[PDB]
Amino acid sequence: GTSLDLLRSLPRVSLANLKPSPNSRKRERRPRDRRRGRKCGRGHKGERQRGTRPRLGFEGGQTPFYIRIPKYGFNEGHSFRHQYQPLSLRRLQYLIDLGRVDPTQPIDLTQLVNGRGVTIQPLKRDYGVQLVEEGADTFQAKINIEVQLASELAIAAIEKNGGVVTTAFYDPRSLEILCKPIPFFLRGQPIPKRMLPPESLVPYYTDAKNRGYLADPAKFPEARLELAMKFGYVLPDITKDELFRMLSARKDPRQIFFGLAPGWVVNMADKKILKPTDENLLKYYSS
Amino acid sequence: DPVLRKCELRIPVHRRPVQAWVESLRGFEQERIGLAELHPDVFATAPRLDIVHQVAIWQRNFRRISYANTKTRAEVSGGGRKPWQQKGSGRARHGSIRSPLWRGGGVAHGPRGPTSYYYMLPMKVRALGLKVALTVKLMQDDLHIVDSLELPTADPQYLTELAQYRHWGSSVLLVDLTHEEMPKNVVAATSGLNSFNLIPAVGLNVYSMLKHQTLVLTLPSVAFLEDKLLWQDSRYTPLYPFRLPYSDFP
Amino acid sequence: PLHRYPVHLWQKLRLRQGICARLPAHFLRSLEEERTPTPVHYKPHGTKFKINPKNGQRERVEDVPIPVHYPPESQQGLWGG
Amino acid sequence: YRAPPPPRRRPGPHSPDPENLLTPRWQLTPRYVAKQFGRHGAISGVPPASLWPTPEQLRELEAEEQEW
Amino acid sequence: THGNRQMTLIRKVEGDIWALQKDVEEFLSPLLGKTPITQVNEVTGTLRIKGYFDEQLKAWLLEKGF
Amino acid sequence: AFVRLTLPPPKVVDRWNEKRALFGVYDNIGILGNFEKHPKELIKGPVWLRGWRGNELQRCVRKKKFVGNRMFIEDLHNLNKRISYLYKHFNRHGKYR
Amino acid sequence: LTYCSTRKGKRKTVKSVVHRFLRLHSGLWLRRKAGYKKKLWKKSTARKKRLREFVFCSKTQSKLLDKMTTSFWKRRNWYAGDPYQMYHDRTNLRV
Amino acid sequence: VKKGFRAAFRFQKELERWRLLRCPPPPVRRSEKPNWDYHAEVQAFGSRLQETFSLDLLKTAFINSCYIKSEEAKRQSNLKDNQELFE
RNA sequence: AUUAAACCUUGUACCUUUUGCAUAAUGAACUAACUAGAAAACUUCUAACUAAAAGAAUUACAGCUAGAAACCCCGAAACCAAAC
Ligand SMILES: [Mg+2]
Ligand SMILES: [Mg+2]
Ligand SMILES: [Mg+2]
Ligand SMILES: [Mg+2]
Ligand SMILES: [Mg+2]
Ligand SMILES: [Mg+2]
Ligand SMILES: [Mg+2]
Ligand SMILES: [Mg+2]
Ligand SMILES: [Mg+2]
């Protein structure tokens, strides 16, 4: 624009002409002068001028406020409670529209992470993502998605458009590998197995109404229909759909990645995969 | 045969490109041999001199370590005993001959040990500074795009006279694509000159551009610089260090 | 200035030079290796993991031996550790 | 003048000297050996069979799994 | 800022920043009942307005087709 | 006060010696070099403060961790005494609580 | 408190605060009432009801409690089935 | 010995002042000192007094007989006096 | 001020501390050199990018990253260990 024309007229830019942005630096004040010297802002002789006032929270000898209030367990066990990041249907629809997630293929945590759709902190006790009903009315996509937790209304929205949603469990060690797979391959170790849910979480993941990954497949057809009746839509049949194979794809309950089995080694340097030939090893991984 | 170059990357529709004369160094009079186009987003950014101030100061300060040191009253030799008793003497009260008040005593508030001044500016900010510096040289007519650095003779005097002939500055910075393949003739001529400096493309920095009056870029380096800087725009944040494998990044 | 080597490695360095080097190999091995004595004055942990009662979580455990003083008279007899 | 060659990271697998007293200990573990194969593939020379657990290690892994 | 001062910001402006200020004042003036208070930053090429008017401005800019 | 009775000998500075001419080169090694090296690795100095900064108490504790076991007896005695003095100042004294 | 610790050079949390109060992400703090388990036989039915409640803290108490805890206790927590999910935010507040 | 040359530079100026007071310099005519052009000075002389002079006449007035003697003595190793105008 | 150095007119030494007051009471023979405010949790200002920011581990219902902005000196009677 016109600004660059000004440069042509003005003298050369050099190390003798530099200037900071105005107001970017304040002035630091030393106690030399009369305004800021003498008593130097500390007051008259006492404990505070000399520099030895009591600590924060001390009230002069009466029992302090933060210790006269009774103890109660608001934060008991906080470091052991499980955490799930929320993913709303507004956010999911937004991501598909801009092309940062590919709806043709199945969607799992790895694909969500790779598109910056979600940020996962395993060291802060994140165990995965839960689908949230907000934005359900305007969801107009057909997809295959796997999440750790789901809500009643969120499941309805996905399926009404002819899609599949399922709930799956990952352990702390597996979750770290899932989010950042490439650094694991650089280590040179075999892929580990996936542990089953703790005892308390077994009822949730073996229940059809939750779309669990360990529930009886025979009972799914009944559950899907009842949602259609309750929320007033017609249950579509996906077997007719051309993409039935994609929508039906599901991984083994002891598998982390779709096309890879426990016990394999990924040699990324020369694009090869190594498999063990020992019966004891094969039996261990397959169990 | 005019040498005409086009930007490999997509220029924004609303921005017209900018151009400069291609030149050669083989002769004293081969000033113009071609016409070239330069991406507007690199060579036509807004003229921000505050950012140029920041990057120049970062370069000078992030390396600094000061080795100034002084002894406190604890580390000076001797001084353990109380010199005289509190009362009777009629002198001032004192407890050690190595306090700051005494000649030969310790320093109350002096420099302490080796100290570092390290800090890092955000990567996008440092990349922006390079674009602004390249823009400034072009708009002020201190940039000269050249096809190659080949020279007829290795005599240092020839290069100096050429700079006088073409109205260059007293100090010239010359950039070539890579260190290993730099032409033999150029290396011999520059090595004996204080003010004419030859560096590879990866060594370009804001501080050297300010120090040297005129910049000289070979055409292959222009494509090199354009690629790296424009990548900083339209990228994600890093999931992990970029040196690790990525789908589409070297 | 600083020493070239850490202090705790000085003993190994001495055995590596001089007439100490000329000693036979396996006897130098006996001096080098240090093995912890069997517990006598404390009870070792049976397991490597235990359930902390207060919070009910699995915790790692270690065995830290008691320091014991051996008077020089002990070298003239056979005390059972 | 001419600037010196740009600094470059050393390429290829790295095998530290075991006897040297000043080699850091962490570089001498089996984990470090495994990393070399992961970064550099076959050029490392690490026997690929070593990457998997040995039979004695396997028994310990299985024993712990049953317990917990 | 300060916990009580609400503002809206239009950031990546190229060309004549002053022309945009005049259009924004005309567009927003009838709603407020007064001319809006604004700041123009020529160096950074941004425009700052007192009060929250993000939704109206977003729709307004789409109509112009930017 | 007393002042010099003669002018000191002149100081002559060469602004185009090798160190001054090539200052700054390779400060962009990462962005222009595909990020194989971080610019901090170009720094020369004490082992315990390469690419790091801290206050005096932090510097003292960091120095002990890196080279504490390779120090002379008397130097180590002074370093330990400095740490305890700085600990009591920063945790018990000052205007602001 | 410890402004600069020897081993890490960081501030330290006062753990007696963490055992007595709850912090909502907006900046409010919750507590119980002193004496809510003591000598209930001599307290009226209205007095006992007031004691059972969860109560908020004043501005000066909130300021002090913030200084005595580190940032980790001030982050966003996404607990499934949280019974305080609806109290972490403010609505219709002009201030 | 303090670092720096600026204090040493300042003190040289004061030593110059002290020397002048004790040993005042002999007088010198302004022509010897810098910033002198004879032609320009003469013209300003007339204009200063708001009177117009003929340059050839005015210059002759300043010349003196004793001046001629000195120049010729130096010359050995034309002009014209102001005697007529004086009378 | 003055023609004029002194004469005439006007004028209760300095720092600290006390009740905002000293003819009170501490301190100072004079010269030269030396001799005492230091840290970034929160806030404000200046920039980069922006539903995302950061060169790995962190924060986020406009945020996030970087810069700048801060908290003195001298002085006991004692207590303990090991020598003489
Ligand atoms: Mg200060
Ligand atoms: Mg988080
Ligand atoms: Mg001492
Ligand atoms: Mg003593
Ligand atoms: Mg003392
Ligand atoms: Mg000294
Ligand atoms: Mg008295
Ligand atoms: Mg006196
Ligand atoms: Mg003095």
How many helix segments of chain G?
A: 3
Tally of strands of chain H:
0
Helix content of chain G: 10-25%
Calculate the terminal CA-CA distance of chain H, rounded to whole Å: 70 Å
What is the assembly state of the chains in this entry? part of a larger assembly
Largest sheet: spatial strand order of chain G: 1-2-3
Global geometry of chain H? elongated
- Give the ordered list of helices and strands of chain G: HEEHEH
The secondary-structure element order of chain H is: HHHHH
Family (chain H): Belongs to the ribonuclease III family. Mitochondrion-specific ribosomal protein mL44 subfamily.
Subcellular location (chain H): Mitochondrion
Function (chain H): Component of the 39S subunit of mitochondrial ribosome. May have a function in the assembly/stability of nascent mitochondrial polypeptides exiting the ribosome.
Protein name (chain H): Large ribosomal subunit protein mL44
Note down, in words, how this protein is organized.
The structure is cut from a larger assembly and holds eight protein chains of eight kinds. Chain C is built from two helices and two strands. Chain C is α+β, with helices and mostly antiparallel strands and about 80 residues long. Chain D is mainly alpha-helical and about 70 residues long. The termini of chain D are far apart. Chain E is about 40% helix and about 20% strand. A three-stranded antiparallel beta sheet of chain E has the order 1-3-2, covered by helices on one side. The longest helix of chain E is centred in the middle third of the chain and has 16 residues, at about 15-30. The relative contact order of chain E is 0.24. Classes of the chains: A alpha/beta (about 290), B alpha/beta (about 250), C alpha+beta (about 80), D mainly alpha (about 70), E alpha+beta (about 70), F mainly alpha (about 100), G alpha+beta (about 100), H mainly alpha (about 90). Chains in contact: A-B, A-D, A-F, A-G, B-D, B-E, B-F, C-D, C-F, D-F, F-G, F-H. The complex binds magnesium ion (9 copies). One magnesium ion binds near residues 119 and 121 of chain A. Chain B binds one RNA strand of 84 nucleotides through helix 2 and helix 3. Chain H: Component of the mitochondrial ribosome large subunit (39S) which comprises a 16S rRNA and about 50 distinct proteins. Chain H: Component of the 39S subunit of mitochondrial ribosome. May have a function in the assembly/stability of nascent mitochondrial polypeptides exiting the ribosome. Chain H: Belongs to the ribonuclease III family. Mitochondrion-specific ribosomal protein mL44 subfamily. Chain H: This is Large ribosomal subunit protein mL44.
Q: What is the topology?
A:
The structure is cut from a larger assembly and holds 8 protein chains of 8 kinds.
Chain D: H1 30-40, H2 55-67
Chain E: E1 7-10, H1 17-32, E2 38-41, E3 46-50, H2 54-64
Antiparallel strand pairs in E: 1-3, 2-3
Chain G: H1 15-18, E1 22-23, E2 29-31, H2 45-51, E3 55-56, H3 59-67
Antiparallel strand pairs in G: 1-2, 2-3
The complex binds magnesium ion (MG) (9 copies).
Chain B binds one RNA strand of 84 nucleotides through helix 2 and helix 3.
Protein name (chain G): Large ribosomal subunit protein bL35m
GO molecular function, one term (chain G): structural constituent of ribosome
Subcellular location (chain G): Mitochondrion
